[PDB]
Amino acid sequence: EQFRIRRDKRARLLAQGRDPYPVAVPRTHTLAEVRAAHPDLPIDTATEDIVGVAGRVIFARNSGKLCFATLQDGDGTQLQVMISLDKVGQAALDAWKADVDLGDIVYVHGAVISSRELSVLADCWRIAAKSLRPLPVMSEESRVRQRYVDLIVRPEARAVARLRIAVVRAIRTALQRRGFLEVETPVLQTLAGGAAARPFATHSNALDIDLYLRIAPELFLKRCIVGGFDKVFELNRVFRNEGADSTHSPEFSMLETYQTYGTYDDSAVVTRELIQEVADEAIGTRQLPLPDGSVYDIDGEWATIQMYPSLSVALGEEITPQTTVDRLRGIADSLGFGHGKLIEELWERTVGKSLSAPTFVKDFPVQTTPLTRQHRSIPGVTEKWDLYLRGIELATGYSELSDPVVQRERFADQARAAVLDEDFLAALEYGMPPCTGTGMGIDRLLMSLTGLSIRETVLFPI
């Protein structure tokens, strides 16, 4: 019902030649600027520094000859205003009382004082916007269907939104210090490749074909290495037409990075530094506090373990690239398609779940890693690592497969479970120098650093 009273203050303001939504207002400082300015003001004393400020009224204490409001800026910073009879306007005070609700954006010019809390004592005042919905005094999934309200009433939502923006800045800073170049590769592709996922298709009207949103930029980033890029990345959305869960969404921000003439050994060291540098820039500590109330140390060096050896110790027997699927299925049952899949799953179900300190696992089954180079010395495994931080599958890197005839086979196997990415394979046969790629999910980065769910990390999900 308050929806109607509010619409009728707008109307009776328009009729009266009052502007409820004025083009401009001369806001001289932010309330943060007015705070940093008067940090220690002897309380109940006045100062002749004049300011125009605008804020959202989020409390009002109306009292005859004197109204007090709390004006909150968009960052949450608060200044109190004092709409007084005596300064200017009995009619201003009546206008104030009658026209000004809660959730109203409001400009006030005048003197900066501290009362018997930092306030502005009004020379003038005007409305900048008239709200036709009162602020509520909120469930998770209603907070997320209405982030704009969440950001006004919930300081934490402000803190989280700024945090992600700061993490993303810190990332670009870290990669740019190291000579990486940020490139833009296609989101619409004739076939989507470079990961294991079911793509979003769309019809094009220009071309009268179906196109596919990128599952991953890897294949196009590898054409940039062929093309002569030394050090490239791309920090931008990927689209995977699968289910949502606590570490999975169909649209999410993902970093990929390629460095020429380094291996997975080299890109492990960079991923650690990059994460540690981000924590410092954006959180101020490598001793990460959690909603637990616990503290997760990500400082220092990080453990590396091999999948097969670590799996062997966990199962009490030698598991090699040679170990048959009949053997592996057997073990699987004893707990509760093919070899590559079984190793990773058995590993995930035994070693994976027990991890707590930040660990790299490396040397992976050749079957489940079609784009990564065969290991230099160990037959049957690829030079790939997964990074687990606070138990989250955070990041991965490869020594990259630059052999086209091998790469052709890897795909010819995939498919038989038969059109390949012939222009990608074309690019490799022009010669791709030896290089190491990485990938990392921005949402998993935040979750691993904060505790925050994926539906708190993204501004506008669904």
Ligand X SMILES: N[C@@H](CCCC[NH3+])C(=O)O
By CB under 6 A, the residues from 250 to 269 that bind ligand DD0 are: 252, 254
Judged by CB under 8 A, which of 129, 163, 325, 355 binds a copy of itself? Answer: 129
Judged by CB under 6 A, which of 103, 340, 358, 437 binds ligand X? Answer: 437
- Residue 405 within binding range of a copy of itself, rule CB under 8 A: yes
CB of 87: closest distance to ligand X in angstroms? 37
Task: Compute the chain's Rg from CA coordinates.
Answer: 29
Could you tell which of a copy of itself, ligand X, ligand DD0, none binds residue 194, using a CB distance below 5 to 8 A set by kind? Answer: ligand X
Is 350 or 402 the residue whose CB approaches a copy of itself more closely?
Answer: 402
- Residue 130 within binding range of ligand DD0, rule CB under 6 A: no
* Total of residues contacting ligand DD0 (CB under 6 A): 16
CB of 92: closest distance to a copy of itself in angstroms? 21
Is 119 or 396 the residue whose CB approaches ligand DD0 more closely?
Answer: 396
Taking the C-alpha atoms of residue 235 and residue 252, their distance in angstroms, rounded to an integer, is 11
CB of 8: closest distance to ligand X in angstroms? 29
By CB under 6 A, the residues from 134 to 163 that bind ligand X are: none
Q: Which stretch binds ligand DD0 (CB under 6 A): 60-68, 101-109, 239-247, 375-383?
A: 239-247
Judged by CB under 6 A, which of 9, 143, 214, 240 binds ligand DD0? Answer: 240
Query: What is the SS3 assignment for the chain?
Result: CHHHHHHHHHHHHHCCCCCCCCCCCCCCCCHHHHHHHCCCCCCCCEEEEEEEEEEEEEEEEEECCEEEEEEECCCCCEEEEEEECCCCCHHHHHHHHHHCCCCEEEEEEEEEEECCCEEEEECCCEEEECCCCCCCCCCHHHHCCCHHHHHHHCHHHHHHHHHHHHHHHHHHHHHHHCCCEECCCCCEECCCCCCCCCCCEEECCCCCCEEEECCCCHHHHHHHHHHCCCEEEEEEEEECCCCCECCECCEEEEEEEEEECCCHHHHHHHHHHHHHHHHHHHHCCCEEECCCCCEEECCCCCEEEEHHHHHHHHHCCCCCCCCCHHHHHHHHHHHCCCHHHHHHHHHHHHCHHHCCCCEEEEEEEHHHCCCECECCCCCCEEEEEEEEECCEEEEEEEEECCCHHHHHHHHHHHHHCCCCCHHHHHHHHCCCCCEEEEEEEHHHHHHHHHCCCHHHHCCCCC
CB of 269: closest distance to a copy of itself in angstroms? 14
Could you tell which of ligand X, a copy of itself, ligand DD0, none binds residue 440, using a CB distance below 5 to 8 A set by kind? Answer: ligand DD0
- Residue 167 within binding range of a copy of itself, rule CB under 8 A: no
Could you tell which of a copy of itself, ligand DD0, ligand X, none binds residue 155, using a CB distance below 5 to 8 A set by kind? Answer: none
By CB under 6 A, the residues from 411 to 450 that bind ligand DD0 are: 439-441, 443-444
CB of 256: closest distance to ligand DD0 in angstroms? 8
- Residue 68 within binding range of a copy of itself, rule CB under 8 A: no
By CB under 6 A, the residues from 186 to 225 that bind ligand X are: 194-195, 216, 218
Could you tell which of ligand X, a copy of itself, ligand DD0, none binds residue 395, using a CB distance below 5 to 8 A set by kind? Answer: ligand DD0
How would you class 330 by CB atoms within 10 Å of its CB: exposed for 0-12, middle for 13-18, buried for 19 or more? exposed
Is 199 or 441 the residue whose CB approaches ligand DD0 more closely?
Answer: 441
By CB under 6 A, the residues from 300 to 339 that bind ligand X are: none
Taking the C-alpha atoms of residue 35 and residue 289, their distance in angstroms, rounded to an integer, is 28
Taking the C-alpha atoms of residue 107 and residue 71, their distance in angstroms, rounded to an integer, is 9
Judged by CB under 6 A, which of 19, 230, 345, 393 binds ligand DD0? Answer: 393
Judged by CB under 6 A, which of 110, 199, 262, 397 binds ligand X? Answer: 397
* Residue numbers at the binding site for ligand DD0 (CB under 6 A): 240, 242, 247-249, 252, 254, 393, 395-396, 439-441, 443-444, 454
Q: List, as residue ranges, the binding site for Mg(2+).
A: 386, 393
Q: List, as residue ranges, the binding site.
A: 386, 393
* Residue numbers at the binding site for ligand X (CB under 6 A): 194-195, 216, 218, 256, 396-398, 400, 437-439
